[PDB]
Amino acid sequence: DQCIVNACKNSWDKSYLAGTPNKDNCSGFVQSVAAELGVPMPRGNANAMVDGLEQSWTKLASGAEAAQKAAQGFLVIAGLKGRTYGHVAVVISGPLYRQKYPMCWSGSIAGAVGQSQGLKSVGQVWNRTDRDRLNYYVYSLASCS
Amino acid sequence: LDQCIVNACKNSWDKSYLAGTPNKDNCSGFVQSVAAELGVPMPRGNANAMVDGLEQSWTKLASGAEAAQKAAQGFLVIAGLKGRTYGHVAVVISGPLYRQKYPMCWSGSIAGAVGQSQGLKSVGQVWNRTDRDRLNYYVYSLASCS
Incomplete structure (x- = not known):
């Protein structure tokens, strides 16, 4: 997953x-x-x-599988729709927080409370309610070799 | 004529997509x-x-003049131009052209007032004098108003 962690580090400094x-x-x-x-x-x-x-990517069964696909070099997006605004983040390999939530990178207009440079899990970026409703989507071709 | 489009623009000015x-x-x-x-x-x-x-799926008009009269018939018309770093888009509305070329528009912009229009600037005043003559005008397939 180093190729995804690298893309995350580079994306952190760009402006889409x-x-x-x-x-x-x-x-x-x-x-x-x-x-x-x-x-x-x-x-x-x-x-x-x-x-x-939801329409075009494979949906994984768990945060544990999201971490495994990331560990196998796949781009995995954690996502949850919101009543007003949704949220997306990039899942990376690493141990599951609370043995359930995978590590991620995320940007956020909300500031540091919504941001992660790889040291927070999705269970620390999303609130204690939303984190168990998250969906994990994986792209069908590995990016890292 | 284009009132439903001008209303949408006013309403969207205060929203956060x-x-x-x-x-x-x-x-x-x-x-x-x-x-x-x-x-x-x-x-x-x-x-x-x-x-x-x-560019791939909307009809491209031939002129800023054509854009204003399609807007006057109730069509959503988007002025857009790609940039090397960032492009720009705006909503064309009806009304007399600026310098007989540039239709009136609404536009948001991160650049602040320079790039912004609440309907009183033409596309020739939100884009610089270089880009204003290279803009494309895309019209939707159905009229939105009445």
Whole structure:
């Protein structure tokens, strides 16, 4: 998964949207990760992205499987629609927080409380309710060799 | 004539298509919220991505003059131009052209007032004098108003 962690580190410093650092934009951060890895990604805000992922990407059964696919070099997106705004993040390999939630990178307009540079799990980026409703989507071709 | 489109623009000015990002400060999000209000499917993404999608699936008008009269007939018309780093999109509205060339528009912009229009600037005043003559005008297949 080093190729995905590298794309995450590089995306953290780019601005998918004009004038908008990806660290402050959860949908744009994922778009730049996918663009660096050559993976087609559904476009728009987080809700629109999750709709698009649900339609065309493989949905995994668990956060444990999300971590395993990431460990096998696949781009894995954690996503959850919201009543007003959804959220997406990139899952990376690593031990599951609370033996359930995989590690991730995420941008966020909300600031550091919604951001992760690989040291928080999705269970620490999403609230104690939303984290068990998350969906994990995987792209069908490995990116890292 | 284009009142339903001008109303959508006014309503979208105060919305936030992207979390935490007012549409007046986000040219791509401003256009998404206008289209959503009108019920019009719109290519998504940043401005460059939107222009890509418009270029592939919307009818391209021949002139800014043609854009204003299609807007006057109630069609959603998007002015768009790709950039080397970032592109730009805006909603064309009816009204007399600026310098007999550039239709009036609404536009959000992260650049602030320079790139913004609430209907009193033409596309020739939000884009610089270089780009304003290279803009494309994309019209939807169905009229949204009446």
